[PDB]
Amino acid sequence: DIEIAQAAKMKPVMELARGLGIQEDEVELYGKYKAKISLDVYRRLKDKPDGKLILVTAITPTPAGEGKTTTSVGLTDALARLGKRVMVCLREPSLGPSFGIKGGAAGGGYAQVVPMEDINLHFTGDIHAVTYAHNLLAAMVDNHLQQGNVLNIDPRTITWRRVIDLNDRALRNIVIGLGGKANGVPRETGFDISVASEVMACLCLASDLMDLKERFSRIVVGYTYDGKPVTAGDLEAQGSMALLMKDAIKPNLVQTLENTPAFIHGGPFANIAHGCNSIIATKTALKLADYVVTEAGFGADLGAEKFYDVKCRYAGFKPDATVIVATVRALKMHGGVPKSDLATENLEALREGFANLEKHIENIGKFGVPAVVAINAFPTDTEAELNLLYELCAKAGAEVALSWAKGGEGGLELARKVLQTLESRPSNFHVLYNLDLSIKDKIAKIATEIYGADGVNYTAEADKAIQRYESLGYGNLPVVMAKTQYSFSDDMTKLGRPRNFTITVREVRLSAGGRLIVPITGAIMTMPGLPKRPAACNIDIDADGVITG
Amino acid sequence: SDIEIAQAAKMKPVMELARGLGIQEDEVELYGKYKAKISLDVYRRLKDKPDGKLILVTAITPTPAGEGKTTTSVGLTDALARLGKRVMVCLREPSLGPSFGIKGGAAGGGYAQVVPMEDINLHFTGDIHAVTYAHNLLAAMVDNHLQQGNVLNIDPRTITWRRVIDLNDRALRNIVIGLGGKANGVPRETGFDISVASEVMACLCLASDLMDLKERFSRIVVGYTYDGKPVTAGDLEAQGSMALLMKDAIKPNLVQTLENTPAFIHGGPFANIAHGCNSIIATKTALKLADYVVTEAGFGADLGAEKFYDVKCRYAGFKPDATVIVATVRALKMHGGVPKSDLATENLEALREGFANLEKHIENIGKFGVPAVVAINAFPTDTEAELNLLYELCAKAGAEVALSWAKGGEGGLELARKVLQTLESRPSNFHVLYNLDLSIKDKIAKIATEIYGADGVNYTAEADKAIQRYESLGYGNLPVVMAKTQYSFSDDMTKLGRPRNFTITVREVRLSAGGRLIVPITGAIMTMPGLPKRPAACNIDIDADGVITG
Ligand SMILES: Nc1ncnc2c1ncn2[C@@H]1O[C@H](COP(=O)(O)OP(=O)(O)OP(O)(O)=S)[C@@H](O)[C@H]1O
Ligand SMILES: Nc1ncnc2c1ncn2[C@@H]1O[C@H](COP(=O)(O)OP(=O)(O)OP(O)(O)=S)[C@@H](O)[C@H]1O
């Protein structure tokens, strides 16, 4: 009965490709229902007009669940119904979690992206391609050391770890290169989940296969003995890294349960990285559709700011609308109601928890972009609970989305407000900070105006880090804040709209292909682990079809 | 010329070739216009139909001078199609790693190639990723189990199951895992072998369908308890999941020769620590779609041909009909003592002396009841006097010259004709070299004695313990898979030719419970090769889309 049990009624992607004016020759199929679209679609429609861009985001995440993706597909079906040319772009899910805790649908209920099972697994192999690009580089680093260490690297400062797309704890901290002189140079490193890879990040912000080629070459792998940074470039790896990505580069065309054309392509981390689907997918989509709907990871404080300040900045996008999702269950949790008690109506809690969404809204304001709230409706979520909220959004447009349950017909109301927004409410999009400010000034501008901290503190380790980067010349880059998503602040316990608090950046990491990363805590969760009773244990496939994936 | 001839190839859509073979559209799964996975439904509905003839191609003891196995197989297949035969060639998928180290070598070679080359050499249909991730999921599961209070009671120090990656990465040979304290796993020594060396890959090649492969996984031994009881993947309830990751990898991939002859590429394991053959699934599907099926085996005939007969044929009921054994003048002369550099110079004496290597392989193939035909892979430097002596010399077997590299199928016409002729007048009487119910040590001697011409076999203490342990754990009625050097009949790689008065030494014996017993000689321990000083990775680029060199 769950979102899986809606495996039913897909149209061959090939014809969809025609329903968009993609030529047959620009389609590399993967069976009938997955295909890869060439980057030629953009290059021949280079100068055509762009359709409108519709970033869906969410309020501060909670154990209550909200529903970005679900609402995003539903936003999409609904626009379909209204005879508009409308595409979605989503992120590809890591394989890892299918076997751990997760194993879920792209969206949900009646607003899903299909075929569900391929998307979760080996899809079109975009992640294996990231994986090999990463590990090849790692290999070249180590081989070089084996080969006499011409570049005079300090093995002890390699910051290039290896990658794999499984929840594997036991690979977090490892020692390689043992066995003697035949078998490499001993050093300490680890693995991270593939999707966390700088290479996954580059895929997602590259203009094209040559932009990818360059960004790879910019990547720092570690430093030499007299502190001079070695690069992917220095190791002549970038060419090979690109070859491995020859196909990953192209976006994947798929569909909605309601046959609405979808791209899913790329999938970065939302803290350590910016957490948007790829730029290739969205700029391509813009030329095939009048209305593109896309999303970002975590809450609008992280995903959206990074959407605007990273993704739009680089790609010359000018977001026209922005939806923000919220649930009643969730806000009550922001009001301080435990996860056990969500069943009960609590109009006073929802009133207090609303402060969260209220801040988020002010932040979408701050970007010169037309906000609109959307509530994913729930079985427990009552009429006085909804009414209390609907009026509480007395500041910016609100609608209810019965999507998870009613399909495109349930996000019919919601899509109206958006289209009314896009016709009557023009945009004035502008990045929050300026790329010539100070790493600190930049962080500060994110902390105060977006989160609402009074100020920012820095550790000893954080300053000699910053120092080095400014003076290594990497100070002109944007800032991608690695912090807990569960609060505006870096204190996860502090839900709602916390006031009179500061932000402390413990460390600073570089991503030379892209931008600058300031961690707030152990965001060190770049490799999660399997649970006591993992899903692998119960996954099976009989003499035909799958139980429990 | 220019062995990226695979550009101008002119490929027929695979779908077209498939319906050409009698495959329905619903049994075809496109990967672009030129690649397809093919349902196991095709075999099922054609189970009752008769097999075509099976032709194995193998070669003489490999050398620095090169021999030409695959080129000859594709070349044969094409020569057969030009003769109007309904034919298929089945080949192994290459590992990705060699592409960035030394190779990125030809689909098959010269005018004998299976294409799309580039994709065959890189991700192809992603069968190797499926193997990598099935294999590592087992590993990750092993570790987490230790991490979760170790109910099954594994001694982590006894875990034989390593990790895997499809790159030449020596630094991953010996590593220490699970560091950082109570939260980060349990410290233990392991390493990574190259993906294609995975037992998960050997299983794929030896499986009959997804259920048997799923079963084979449940028997995989990962380690031992504190008490010495074996612990298996079944015991970790992992086989379902691994099976899941192989849902598509289980289907063979349809592709074509430069001449549009259909071809299957599927699986590609090692030929020492495994049997170096492509998958039973491809081959068995090809026997029902085609009147003739050409396939090959890794290394020389003493290893790959042996294992093809004694492992792959054993499991599948195949009865090989003929065998094409590939040799060159230049390699034979090396075997007769000529150094790599002086190979162009005419030398009928070292040719005569080196022929002993070829003679022996012929003799061996004889021992399975399958008639042999030699293929001479012509080289421009070979004199008439030379080639001619090589024929006189092949006194026992059909001989021919293959010009398959230079002249496509047409160069294979002579060979093709010799095979068809053997097919018609000299039916095989196939039988494996050994019964399963001998002991490990008896089986080994059969192989070492009969096929290597070894005097006998010696064993170290470690070998003796291992064989005693495996036999009492009940794995002693299984086939034996010799991992030795391929550069020699002996396990001294420097003994070329047909060495005599020699002895094999088994140093260490390992178990693959998705099949059988692996017994190593030297450092055939090399299950994770390394990158050279100047790796091909450094001189690879892409521009407009012009993939330069590799
Ligand atoms: N209106 C609804 N009624 C019932 N369940 C819902 C509803 N909306 C979402 N869900 C469930 O909430 C789960 C995920 O909620 P979240 O993870 O907060 O949303 P998300 O992280 O943006 O990704 P999703 O699954 O597309 S909402 C999904 O597995 C859905 O099954
Ligand atoms: N007349 C010829 N001139 C030049 N090269 C030739 C000629 N005939 C054969 N070859 C070689 O045949 C080689 C083909 O190698 P493959 O067939 O891919 O490997 P294989 O021959 O199946 O087994 P190995 O590993 O090479 S011993 C090419 O690399 C060529 O160098």
From Swiss-Prot, chain B:
Pathway: One-carbon metabolism; tetrahydrofolate interconversion. Its EC number is 6.3.4.3. The keyword Nucleotide-binding applies. Keywords: ATP-binding, Ligase, Nucleotide-binding, One-carbon metabolism. It catalyses: (6S)-5,6,7,8-tetrahydrofolate + formate + ATP = (6R)-10-formyltetrahydrofolate + ADP + phosphate. Pfam families: FTHFS. One of its GO terms (biological process) is tetrahydrofolate interconversion. The keyword Protease does not apply. InterPro entries: Formate_THF_ligase, Formate_THF_ligase_CS, P-loop_NTPase. It is an enzyme of class 6 (ligase). It comes from the Bacteria. ATP binds at residues 63-70. GO terms for molecular function: ATP binding; formate-tetrahydrofolate ligase activity. Belongs to the formate--tetrahydrofolate ligase family. Binding of monovalent cations contributes to thermal stability. Homotetramer. This is Formate--tetrahydrofolate ligase. It comes from Moorella thermoacetica.
